[PDB]
Symmetry: C3
């Protein structure tokens, strides 16, 4: 079987973020042009998807972590991860 991943990137360097779901936990690895390192994101989930967008040169990331039938949105706007407003119904 296997872990499940999601990936996003931005800019021209680029920056890359890769999220991995394994045993109900999602972790994050990061590339900013030099090498890979572990990111701050660490939240529960069996499944993960991600999207991101720039405002000028500032990144915003949304990570959708699902356990069973519950999907939690996690927000990065440049200063820490927080739960977002997403609901499924």
């Amino acid at each position: 079987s296997s872990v499940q991943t999601a990936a996003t990137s931005w800019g021209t360097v680029p920056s890359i973020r890769v999220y991995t779901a394994n045993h109900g936990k999602i972790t994050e690895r990061c590339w900013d042009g030099k090498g890979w390192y572990t990111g701050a994101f660490n939240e529960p989930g069996d499944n993960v998807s991600v999207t991101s967008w720039l405002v000028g040169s500032a990144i915003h990331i949304r990570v959708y972590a699902s356990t069973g039938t519950t999907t939690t949105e996690w927000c990065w706007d440049g200063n820490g991860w927080t739960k977002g407003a997403y609901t499924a119904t």
Copy 2:
């Protein structure tokens, strides 16, 4: 276990679309800057991926819904969802 999602976004507001596969059915939730609401997309699938692109300010979305070994592409060009030309072989 859990549902499986895919996500896309565009612009700077942004607009966000989150697709969720659960019990062989995919549904869609939408954010356009104000709050989340249910979108028009509703098609069968155990698995889902998505990509989207802008022409100027008009969005185009492609959703790849898979059941067993059959992957159906669904197209949004601004005026309703239709099946696209994608085939796997």
Copy 3:
């Protein structure tokens, strides 16, 4: 049950790439504006995610293929697929 896919696109034509994981093998289908055709990517994986970015008009693609707990990054910079530096720890 079902195969698992990931998708990316770029430009305004657009170009689209759709990766499908089935039986521990990932393959690639390609659209460049005319029709769909099979791409060069063919590597092992039970799970797949993808991201891509432009430099001017040149595409770069990163495909994250996972089997069990091992995630291999595959790089397209315009001249063949190679393994990238990604590690999970």
